[PDB]
Design a protein around this ligand. Structure first.
Ligand SMILES: [Ca+2]
Ligand SMILES: [Ca+2]
Ligand SMILES: [Ca+2]
Ligand SMILES: [Ca+2]
Lengths: 92, 92
């Protein structure tokens, strides 16, 4: 079928199962965010080393500076990866 | 590997190949937008009937009202589907 239908389900599905690991299922905590980047998304970003890097990066995706990242803020991070990544992904 | 890596590649990959159908590879035209919804995304939206519906909907994702939808605007539509869709996708 349409690839977007599978990606839309996978994007939402991963958030529900991944965020459901802790008793917090309706919001994402600061510690969980570090784990998400450490999982295997280091390909887009490889500057993780000191805790200050996560804090500096966390402020960038924070739009209302609420101190926490909800599902709406998580979508903003996805936009950051597409805009930051180059379109030279065409040929290897 | 991480599901997000496959989805990030599929989201960008589909845009390059799908938008490359017409000589316009750097921007999306109004007619192409109707085809995208008509493809098989009618699941999220099933109110397509008169051309006015597309125009009313097109204005909603338009942020700068430039009269055309670029790659940045396309991302906004994805956010609209996630916010509009309910989270009751858990159990069938
Ligand atoms: Ca959580
Ligand atoms: Ca925030
Ligand atoms: Ca195009
Ligand atoms: Ca526009």
């Amino acid at each position: 079928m349409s690839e977007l239908e599978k990606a839309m389900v996978a994007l939402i599905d991963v958030f529900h199962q991944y965020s459901g690991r802790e008793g917090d299922k309706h919001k994402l905590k600061k510690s969980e965010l570090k784990e998400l980047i450490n999982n295997e998304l280091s390909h887009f970003l490889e500057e993780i080393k000191e805790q200050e890097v996560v804090d500096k990066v966390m402020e960038t995706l924070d739009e209302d500076g609420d101190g926490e990242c909800d599902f709406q803020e998580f979508m903003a991070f996805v936009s950051m990866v597409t805009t930051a990544c180059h379109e030279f992904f065409e040929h290897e």
